[PDB]
Design a protein around this ligand. Structure first.
Ligand SMILES: Nc1ncnc2c1ncn2[C@@H]1O[C@H](COP(=O)(O)OP(=O)(O)OP(=O)(O)O)[C@@H](O)[C@H]1O
Ligand SMILES: Nc1ncnc2c1ncn2[C@@H]1O[C@H](COP(=O)(O)OP(=O)(O)OP(=O)(O)O)[C@@H](O)[C@H]1O
Ligand SMILES: [K+]
Ligand SMILES: [K+]
Ligand SMILES: [K+]
Ligand SMILES: [K+]
Ligand SMILES: [K+]
Ligand SMILES: [K+]
Ligand SMILES: [K+]
Ligand SMILES: [K+]
Ligand SMILES: [K+]
Ligand SMILES: [K+]
Ligand SMILES: [K+]
Ligand SMILES: [K+]
Ligand SMILES: [K+]
Ligand SMILES: [K+]
Ligand SMILES: [K+]
Ligand SMILES: [K+]
Ligand SMILES: [K+]
Ligand SMILES: [K+]
Ligand SMILES: [K+]
Ligand SMILES: [K+]
Ligand SMILES: [K+]
Ligand SMILES: [K+]
Ligand SMILES: [K+]
Ligand SMILES: [K+]
Ligand SMILES: [K+]
Ligand SMILES: [K+]
Ligand SMILES: [K+]
Ligand SMILES: [K+]
Ligand SMILES: [K+]
Ligand SMILES: [K+]
Ligand SMILES: [K+]
Ligand SMILES: [K+]
Ligand SMILES: [K+]
Ligand SMILES: [K+]
Ligand SMILES: [K+]
Ligand SMILES: [Mg+2]
Ligand SMILES: [Mg+2]
Ligand SMILES: [Mg+2]
Ligand SMILES: [Mg+2]
Ligand SMILES: [Mg+2]
Ligand SMILES: [Mg+2]
Ligand SMILES: [Mg+2]
Ligand SMILES: [Mg+2]
Ligand SMILES: [Mg+2]
Ligand SMILES: [Mg+2]
Ligand SMILES: [Mg+2]
Ligand SMILES: [Mg+2]
Ligand SMILES: [Mg+2]
Ligand SMILES: [Mg+2]
Ligand SMILES: [Mg+2]
Ligand SMILES: [Mg+2]
Ligand SMILES: [Mg+2]
Ligand SMILES: [Mg+2]
Ligand SMILES: [Mg+2]
Ligand SMILES: [Mg+2]
Ligand SMILES: [Mg+2]
Ligand SMILES: [Mg+2]
Ligand SMILES: [Mg+2]
Ligand SMILES: [Mg+2]
Ligand SMILES: [Mg+2]
Ligand SMILES: [Mg+2]
Ligand SMILES: [Mg+2]
Ligand SMILES: [Mg+2]
Ligand SMILES: [Mg+2]
Ligand SMILES: [Mg+2]
Ligand SMILES: [Mg+2]
Ligand SMILES: [Mg+2]
Ligand SMILES: [Mg+2]
Ligand SMILES: [Zn+2]
Lengths: 48, 534
RNA sequence: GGAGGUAUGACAA
RNA sequence: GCGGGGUGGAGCAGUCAGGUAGCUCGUCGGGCUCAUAACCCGAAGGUCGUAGGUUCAAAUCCUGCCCCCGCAACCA
RNA sequence: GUGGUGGCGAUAGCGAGAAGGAUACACCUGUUCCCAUGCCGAACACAGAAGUUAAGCUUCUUAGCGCCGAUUGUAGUGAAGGGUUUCCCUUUGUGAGAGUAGGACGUCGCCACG
RNA sequence: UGAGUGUUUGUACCACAUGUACAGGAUAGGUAGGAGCCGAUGAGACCGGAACGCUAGUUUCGGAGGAGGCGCUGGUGGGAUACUACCCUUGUGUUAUGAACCCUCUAACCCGCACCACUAAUCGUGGUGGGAGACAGUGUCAGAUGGGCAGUUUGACUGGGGCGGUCGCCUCCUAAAAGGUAACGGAGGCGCCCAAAGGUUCCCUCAGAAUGGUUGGAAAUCAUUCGAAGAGUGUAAAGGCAGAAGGGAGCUUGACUGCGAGACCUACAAGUCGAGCAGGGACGAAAGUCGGGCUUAGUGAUCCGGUGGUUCCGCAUGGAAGG
RNA sequence: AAGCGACUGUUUAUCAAAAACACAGGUCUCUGCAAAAUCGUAAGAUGAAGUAUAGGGGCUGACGCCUGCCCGGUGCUGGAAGGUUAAGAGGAUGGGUUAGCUUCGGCGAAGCUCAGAAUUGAAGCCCCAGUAAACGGCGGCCGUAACUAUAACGGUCCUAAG
RNA sequence: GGUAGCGGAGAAAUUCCAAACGAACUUGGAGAUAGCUGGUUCUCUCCGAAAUAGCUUUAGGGCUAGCCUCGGAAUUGAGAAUGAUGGAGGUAGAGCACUGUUUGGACUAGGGGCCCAUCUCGGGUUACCGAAUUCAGAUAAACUCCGAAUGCCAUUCAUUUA
RNA sequence: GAAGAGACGGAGCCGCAGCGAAAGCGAGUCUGAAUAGGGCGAAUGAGUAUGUAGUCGUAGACCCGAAACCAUGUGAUCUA
RNA sequence: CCUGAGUACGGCGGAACACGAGAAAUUCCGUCGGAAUCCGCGGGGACCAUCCCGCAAGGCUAAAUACUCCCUAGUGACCGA
RNA sequence: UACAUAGCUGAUUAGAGGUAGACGCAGAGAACUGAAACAUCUUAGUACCUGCAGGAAGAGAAAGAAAAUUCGAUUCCCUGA
C-alpha cells in the first residue's frame, strides 16, 4: 500500500515536504536529511 | 478515563480505528480480548507511554498503580527487597535531596531560591509518602501472600514464576495507588494465591482495570467488561460479567449476520432481473428499459451493502511424533538437587514414565516444579542420581518464562530450522495466526501471548515424542487454551506437563500425578484436590 | 380344568 | 454478444476472504447370510478443464485459451 | 621506426596470410607493500626485469565478406492536359530503390624516443 | 396541572456507632491544644445483658455499692496515651429532601349522561346530581410513519430513435516524408509502482548456438568458442539507448528551498522544456553531475471543509470570536 | 352447436352497449358507540334519531361440486427480555475574558460567556410469534422394466414451498 | 331544492359538471416563458464572410479563437510570389537488412507405423511427416538496409509585388 | 426664475500613484534569507463635463404565437 | 422613597434586519423558563474587561413626503376618426 | 336560588353601507419566471384577498448615531455605492 505522507522538520516542527511511501516496504516512519527553508539548513525530517 | 476517535497503527497492522470508550469512576473493569487485540497497548496509552496517532485519550489526575504483564528486572543482581522498595519514590527523592544539600554548601547566593524550592517540595513530598513505610512493607509481605523473608534477600531473577508474580503484585499494592491497572495479575499464581488476590480485589474500593484470560477470576470481581475487538479495531463496553458480554456479543453478531443476509438477497434479486433483461431480445424495448432502471437500483444497493467482518481465525495445531515412544521413555533414579545455598528440593527422587502417558508434576509456587523440568532437559545437572532418556525418546521443551526466543530477531528468524524450508515455515506460522509480513516483525514488539504461540510453534516443528511443557496455557487467550488442551489430548506421545489451570489438565486427561515437595507418584484422579487441600 | 369383563427366494421334480 | 458451469464414477462443497482437497451415493476387497439385499471392516479413485502470470506458497487471485449449458442476434 | 594522442561517414572495418621487437609496447616474474576478488594477485593494485615475439600490438600482402559507389534505363512524382476514369495515357520538370562500371586493406595533425 | 399513600433510589445536614498491621502496658484514625481532666449532677472495683470483634479484647445497657479514677510523668513506637475541638474511614438511624415508579384522592379540565331555569328550545349559557380526572383535549418542541398530497429530476454521442458500445488520459496505424487532421475506423494501454527500480563515483556487457561435463532430464549451475544486439530497459506501444538510458558495488537523499532569461503548445483555463542566479547540500581527487525514474499515461477547476505554519487583519480600545 | 357473462339492469351525451360495471350470494377484515369511516382548521354534520343478525372497507361474483402446497420475503396482528434511538432533563470537563499573582516567561479565583461528555429519555427499527378468500410464490440434474421406447422406482442439489 | 374545480358526481367510461374536462368557465399575475417557427418597411457607394477548432446536460443553442468590416499606433518592412542556398521529416516507389505472411528445391535434427531385437533395445524402411540451415521466389496501413517528387521551416540573400 | 435659460449650491464623483491578501511601504512595491531574479507599476501623462452615434447591461427591450402554472371569483336552467 | 415585571433576558421553533444560522449582534412572533433596579440597567455586530454613549419594557405630536375620483384656470416639436 | 346575577322591558348612545380601479398601515400571501434543468435562492413580501384608515398615512423626541470628538426627535431628496 503506497500512500502520500508529510516530512516534518524535527528542529522546527515545520511540515516542509510532501512525498509518498509504501507502508508495507517501509513500515517505520521515513526519515531524511532535507533542507529546511525556515532554518535555511539541512535538518532531519521525519514522517508524521 | 475517556478516549475519543482513538487511532493507532504500528507500521501496516492497525490496533485502534476510531475507537472510543468511557469508563466511570469506581468501576472494576474487566478488559478482554484475544492475544494481540491491544489490551496491553491500552494501558500504555493510559500511562502515556504511547501516543495515539489521532484522537484524544483522557485520564484522571489520580495516581495509577500499574502491574506489567512482564516482570521488569533492570539488573540480574537486584534483590527482592530492592525491587519492592523501588515501588515508592522514597529512595529516588532522597538521592536528589542529598544532592540539593551538596549544592547548598557550594552555592552561596546564586541558586539558593531554586534549591530551597526543590528542597521544600522533596520534604513535603517525602512526608506525603511517609518515610515510616520501611516497617509497613516488611509486614505487607506477611499479610499479603505469606511471602517468606528468606526470599526478601534473594535475587529477584532467581525467584520462580509464581513467586515473581507475588512480588510484582505486592509492589503495585506497596505503591499505594489510586487506580489499579492489573495486567494478568494471576498469570503464574497457584490456586491458593489466586484466592487472596480475588478477595483483595473484591474489597478494593477504588477503580481497577484488569486484563485477564481467566473468566472465573474476572466473574468474581468484574462489574463492567471492556472487549477489545481484533477485527474491527474498536472498543465495546458492556455491563455485567464475562458471560453477559458473550451473550450480548453473540446476539449482536447474529443480528448483524441476518441483516447482511437480507441485503444480499435483495441484491441477488435485482441482479437476477438485470440479467434477464440483459439476455432478452433487443426487440423487447420495455424489458430492456426496465433492465437499465433496475441496473441503477442494483448499483445503489451494492454501494450500501455492509461487509460482514471476517471472523477471526483460530489456531490449528497438528502435533505428531516422528518416531515412536518406548515403554520407558525417561528413567529418573535417586536424583537429588539443591540450588547452591538453599535447602534440598528433593532427595533420592526416583520415577519412571511409561510411554504415551500424561504425567502431571503437581505442586505449589516455588516448590521445584520448573526446577525438575530444567533438571530433565540438562539445564540443571543433578546433585545426585541419574536421568536416562531412552534412545527412542525425542524431547521438546516449553519453558515457563519464554526464554527460548531471540527478542532481537524476527518471527521467521526465530522459527528458522535446518529441517524446514521457507514456505513450510510460513504455512505453520499462518496456522498460528502470523500472516504475511507479520512474520518479519521483531519478537521484541510482540505481546506475551503472541510470543507463546511462537514457542509452541517451535515445539510443534520438532516433532518430538516427549513433550516437557511448563505451564503451556499461560499467556494464551481462553479460545487458544482449549485448542491447546484438545490437541494435546490427542497427542500420540508422552507428555510431562505442569499447569495450574484446572481446565487444561482435564482436557489433557492426566494419568499419573507427581506431587511436590513430597515425592508421590500417584494415579491421576479428583484426589488431586485432596493433595492441594493438604 | 374350562368359559363371558378388563426385506426377498425362476420353474418342474 | 449476455450470463452460468469445468474438483475422484455421479451429485456437490470448498473458492469470496492464498497455506490443510473434502461430503452423499457409487466401485473394489473382505466380513455377516443357506443365498441376495441391508449392515460391518478395509482400499482405491482426482495434483481441481487447460496454458501462462502473481505470490514464500494458488482448487482459491489475475490473463488467455478449450469445452458444456440457457439466452440473444432486431424492433414501426 | 615505434609509442602516446586526436580530426575526418568502415574508401579507416572484418577475414586470411606474412614479417618485427633496437628502443618503445607487450606479454612476462612475483604478492611485502597501498589496493582487490559477491571464490580466485585471473582482473584491478603494487613491486620487478629471468625469458619470448608465442599472442596482443606494429608494418606488409590480399577484394573473401562488409563499406563507398558514377553513368544509362526504369518506378514514383510537381505542373499542364487527355481517356473508354476502382485505372490508364501524353507534355514538361524531377528522379529513385534495385542492378552494375568502378573505388577502396585509409587519410589529416601534434607530442616523445629514434 | 393540584393534592396524598407507599416503594426504590440520589443529595445534604443531624445523630449515632467503628478504627486491633510490627513493636508497643494494648483495639494507636489524623491534626491542634492539652496538665491538668473527670466522678455524691453517683467514681473506682464487682456482677448480668447486648453489640462489635482481627478473638486479643472494645463499646454500650443494667444489679448492687458508694468515692474515686484517668492523664502528665515513665518505656514502646513513625506516630502515646486523659479530655476538648476540628475533622477522616466504615455502617446504623432522624430530618430535609430531589427524583423514578405505585396506586388513591379531588377542586382545575372534559361529558353527543339525567334533571332544573333562561324558554316556545335535542342550540347555548348557568344550576344540581352522576361519570371521568390531573388523564384526556389544547399550545410549543421532538422522534416515527406518511405517493394521502405537492414541487421537481429521471444524460449526451448515435448513418432515425431504441438495444449494445462510448465519454478523461497515454502509444501506434489511418495521417497523404513539417505540424495538425475525422469516422460507432484498425490495434493496445492508464487511474500506478519504486526508499531504490532515485542521485553520484567506480566498475561490467547481453540473448542465443555449438562442444564438454554427477545428480541433471530440451532446459537448473560450470568451462571454451562463436556471437552488434537478434537481450534488457517496473508497467501498453512508438521513439531511444551496447561511449549505455542495460547490469553490479560503495556512499548517499537533488524524489532540494526561492526562482527563472527564453522557448514550445494553446480559444481560455491549463500543459511542456529550460540554461542560469542565490541558499544549503549528496557523490567525486578533480572535472563535474544531481530540482526523481530512457522518454511520452498514473489524473480533477472552483466552492466548502480538515490539519500545520504565519512579524497579516482584529467593527470604541485590549483580547477573543472569526478571517 | 361452441365461447363469454348467471339472470332484469348500467356504461364512454357526440366513432366502442360488450366478455366491461352493477348485482343477489361468498369471504376476509375494521368497528362496544362521542363506534369505525367520511366532510370540515374548528364548531357542526353524515354514519344513525342506527348499536356487532349493525355500520364501513377489500376482494370474489346466481346456483352446483370444489377452492391444494408455502408464513422464508413484504404488509398486518400480537409480544417485550435485549440492541439502537429525538427533544427535554443533566452538567464531569475544555476554551474566551481578568481581579490577583508572577522568574520577559507564565499562572489564574469569582462572575459572565463559548462548547460540552457520562447519566436519563417514548414510539419506531432490529428481534420473536401468528396470519395467505393478506401482498405474493408454487424447482433442477443423473440413473433405472422381458424388443424398443418410456420410467412405477433410486440417487443427489436447491427452496418458504416446489 | 343540495353537492363546485386543490372540487363535486360517477351500477366506473378518465364518465359528466352549460354544444371540446387526464382537471370547467371568467377575470387578474400577464406583454407568463418559448435556445422554436413566422415577420421586420427608402436608396446608392466601399469592402465582404462562414458553414471550422476547442469546451459545453452539448449537438438545429452558446462562449473564446479562426474567417469579415471600421478606426488607430508603430516598425530594422516584418506579408505574398519566384529563385538561390541550408535544413527537419520516412510518404510514393522500391527492398528483404529486422518483424510478420509465404512458395518450391537441397539437406536434416527430430517425429511417425513395419519387422528383427525387446530389458524396447540398435537398426532399415516409405521419394511417410519433418523443425533448423541453405538455395531460389514472393508479400505488408500498424515491416524497413533504402528512399523521391512535392509540401514545410529558415536566410539582415536576390527579383517582383504590397 | 416663465413648467425656460441662468445664478447660487464643491457635499460628492472622475483624474493627478502604485504595489501587497493585509499590516504597510511608496516611484516604487510584492515574493524572497537576498544589494538576486521575477510580477505589477514609474520612467514613457491626460484627463474630465456635456452632446452625438455604435454596442452592451437592467427593464416585455425588435414584433406576433403556445400547450401550460398560480390567485380571486361565476356556474348543477345541460349533465351525474 | 420613586423612576414602567411575568417585563428585559435565556432555551427551543420561526420571522424582520442588504445579512439565506452563519462567528453572528440588533428587532419581532409562539412556547417554556425567567432579572436587576442607581454601587442600577441597555448598547457600541459572538463573548469578556476597560472606556464611551444612552435610560427600555406607557402615550401624543405639525412641516418637509405619497396619491388625484373630482372642481377651476391653463399648457403640449401630444392624437386628429 | 336566599341575596344576587343572568334574562326581559324601556330610555339613551354610536355603528352598519359606499367609495377614487390612486395614495397609507396591517393580517394572509402565490405561480409562471430567473438560476439557461431544479429543491436553497429568484420572481417577491410582488399579484390577489381581507381589515383599518386619513387627507395624507406611517415614523417621531434617543436604553440613538458615533469614536475627527463630537452630534442631538422623525420624515423625505442628493451622496455614500
Ligand atoms: N512497536 C510495535 N511495533 C509493531 N507492532 C506492535 C508494536 N507494539 C505492539 N504491536 C502490536 O500491537 C498488537 C497489540 O498490542 P498488545 O501487545 O497490547 O496486545 P495484547 O492483547 O496485550 O496481547 P496479550 O493479551 O496476549 O498479552 C501486538 O500484536 C503487537 O504485535
Ligand atoms: N537459579 C536459582 N537460583 C537460586 N534459587 C533458585 C533458583 N531457581 C529456583 N530457585 C528456587 O527454587 C525454588 C523452586 O524452584 P522452581 O523454579 O522450580 O519453582 P516452581 O515449581 O516452578 O513454582 P512456580 O512455577 O509455581 O512459580 C524457588 O523457591 C526458587 O526460589
Ligand atoms: K601479473
Ligand atoms: K607478437
Ligand atoms: K578494407
Ligand atoms: K394533560
Ligand atoms: K440511415
Ligand atoms: K547506486
Ligand atoms: K357483463
Ligand atoms: K352477474
Ligand atoms: K361462471
Ligand atoms: K345491449
Ligand atoms: K362499465
Ligand atoms: K362460487
Ligand atoms: K363485503
Ligand atoms: K384479492
Ligand atoms: K358483495
Ligand atoms: K410467506
Ligand atoms: K410473514
Ligand atoms: K473562569
Ligand atoms: K354515468
Ligand atoms: K523479410
Ligand atoms: K508503408
Ligand atoms: K528585488
Ligand atoms: K521590481
Ligand atoms: K476633450
Ligand atoms: K460619449
Ligand atoms: K419591449
Ligand atoms: K435592446
Ligand atoms: K340540475
Ligand atoms: K440573528
Ligand atoms: K451603540
Ligand atoms: K447611546
Ligand atoms: K384614484
Ligand atoms: K419556483
Ligand atoms: K432556462
Ligand atoms: K401621525
Ligand atoms: Mg498483552
Ligand atoms: Mg514453575
Ligand atoms: Mg542508386
Ligand atoms: Mg407526484
Ligand atoms: Mg417550477
Ligand atoms: Mg439523443
Ligand atoms: Mg442506431
Ligand atoms: Mg506528419
Ligand atoms: Mg504532409
Ligand atoms: Mg533503469
Ligand atoms: Mg476590537
Ligand atoms: Mg465591538
Ligand atoms: Mg350480462
Ligand atoms: Mg339486458
Ligand atoms: Mg358514443
Ligand atoms: Mg353505439
Ligand atoms: Mg370479477
Ligand atoms: Mg383507460
Ligand atoms: Mg359538454
Ligand atoms: Mg410577472
Ligand atoms: Mg469585391
Ligand atoms: Mg508501397
Ligand atoms: Mg353556486
Ligand atoms: Mg339550482
Ligand atoms: Mg432575511
Ligand atoms: Mg422567547
Ligand atoms: Mg441585547
Ligand atoms: Mg452621558
Ligand atoms: Mg405629518
Ligand atoms: Mg375609435
Ligand atoms: Mg378620413
Ligand atoms: Mg429555470
Ligand atoms: Mg376624513
Ligand atoms: Zn526546520
Amino acid at each position: 500500500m503506497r500512500v502520500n505522507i508529510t516530512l516534518e522538520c524535527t528542529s522546527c516542527k515545520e511540515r516542509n515536504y510532501l512525498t509518498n511511501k509504501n507502508k508495507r516496504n517501509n513500515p517505520d516512519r521515513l526519515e531524511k536529511q532535507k533542507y529546511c527553508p525556515r532554518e535555511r539548513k539541512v535538518t532531519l525530517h521525519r514522517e508524521t | 478515563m475517556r478516549g475519543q476517535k482513538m487511532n493507532l497503527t504500528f507500521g501496516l497492522e492497525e490496533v485502534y480505528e476510531d475507537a472510543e470508550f468511557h469508563l466511570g469512576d469506581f468501576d472494576k473493569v474487566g478488559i478482554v480480548g484475544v492475544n494481540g487485540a491491544g489490551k496491553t497497548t491500552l494501558f500504555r496509552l493510559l500511562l502515556r507511554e504511547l501516543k495515539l496517532d489521532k484522537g484524544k485519550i483522557t485520564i484522571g489526575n489520580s495516581r495509577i498503580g500499574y502491574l506489567p504483564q512482564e516482570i521488569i528486572i533492570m539488573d540480574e543482581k537486584m534483590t527482592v527487597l530492592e525491587f519492592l522498595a523501588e515501588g515508592r519514590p522514597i529512595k529516588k527523592m532522597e538521592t536528589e535531596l542529598n544532592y540539593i544539600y551538596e549544592k547548598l554548601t557550594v552555592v552561596d547566593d546564586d541558586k539558593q531560591d531554586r534549591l530551597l524550592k526543590r528542597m521544600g517540595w522533596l520534604q513535603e513530598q517525602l512526608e506525603y509518602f511517609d518515610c515510616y513505610e520501611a516497617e509497613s512493607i516488611l509486614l505487607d509481605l506477611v499479610d499479603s501472600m505469606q511471602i517468606d523473608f528468606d526470599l526478601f534477600d534473594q535475587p529477584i531473577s532467581e525467584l520462580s514464576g509464581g513467586q515473581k508474580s507475588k512480588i510484582s503484585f505486592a509492589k503495585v499494592l506497596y505503591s499505594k495507588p489510586e487506580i489499579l491497572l492489573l495486567d494478568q495479575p494471576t498469570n503464574h499464581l497457584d490456586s491458593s494465591t489466586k484466592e487472596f488476590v480475588t478477595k483483595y480485589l473484591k474489597s478494593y474500593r477504588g477503580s481497577v482495570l484488569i486484563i485477564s484470560h481467566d473468566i472465573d477470576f474476572l466473574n468474581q470481581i468484574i462489574d463492567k467488561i471492556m472487549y477489545i475487538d481484533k477485527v474491527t479495531h474498536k472498543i465495546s463496553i458492556y455491563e455485567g460479567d464475562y458471560y453477559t458480554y458473550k451473550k450480548k456479543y453473540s446476539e449482536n453478531q447474529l443480528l448483524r449476520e441476518k441483516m447482511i443476509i437480507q441485503q444480499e438477497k435483495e441484491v441477488k434479486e435485482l441482479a437476477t432481473f438485470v440479467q434477464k433483461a440483459k439476455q432478452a431480445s433487443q426487440t423487447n424495448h420495455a424489458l430492456k428499459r426496465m433492465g437499465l432502471e433496475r441496473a441503477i437500483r442494483l448499483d445503489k444497493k451494492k454501494k450500501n451493502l455492509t461487509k460482514r467482518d471476517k471472523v477471526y481465525k483460530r489456531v490449528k495445531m497438528d502435533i505428531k511424533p516422528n518416531r515412536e515412544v518406548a515403554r520407558t521413555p525417561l528413567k529418573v533414579e535417586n536424583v537429588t538437587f539443591h540450588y547452591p545455598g538453599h535447602p534440598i528440593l528433593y532427595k533420592d527422587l526416583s520415577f519412571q514414565i511409561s510411554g504415551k502417558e500424561r504425567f502431571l508434576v503437581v505442586g505449589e509456587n516455588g516448590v521445584g516444579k520448573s526446577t525438575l523440568l530444567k533438571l530433565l532437559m540438562g539445564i540443571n545437572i543433578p546433585d545426585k542420581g541419574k536421568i536416562i532418556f531412552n534412545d527412542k525418546t525425542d524431547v521438546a521443551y516449553y519453558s515457563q518464562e519464554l526464554e527460548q526466543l531471540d527478542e532481537e530477531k524476527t518471527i521467521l528468524e526465530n522459527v528458522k530450522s535446518d529441517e524446514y524450508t521457507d514456505w513450510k515455515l510460513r504455512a505453520t506460522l499462518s496456522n498460528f495466526l502470523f500472516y504475511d509480513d507479520d512474520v518479519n516483525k521483531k519478537v521484541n514488539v510482540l505481546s506475551p501471548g503472541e510470543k507463546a504461540r511462537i514457542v509452541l510453534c517451535k515445539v510443534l516443528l520438532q516433532k518430538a515424542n516427549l513433550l516437557i511443557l511448563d505451564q503451556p496455557t499461560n499467556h494464551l487467550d481462553p479460545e487458544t487454551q482449549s485448542i491447546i488442551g484438545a490437541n494435546f489430548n490427542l497427542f500420540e506421545g508422552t507428555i510431562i506437563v505442569v499447569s495450574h489451570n484446572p481446565s487444561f489438565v482435564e482436557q489433557i486427561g492426566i494419568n499419573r500425578m507427581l506431587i511436590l515437595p513430597s515425592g508421590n507418584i500417584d494415579n491421576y484422579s479428583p484426589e488431586l484436590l485432596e493433595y492441594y487441600s493438604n
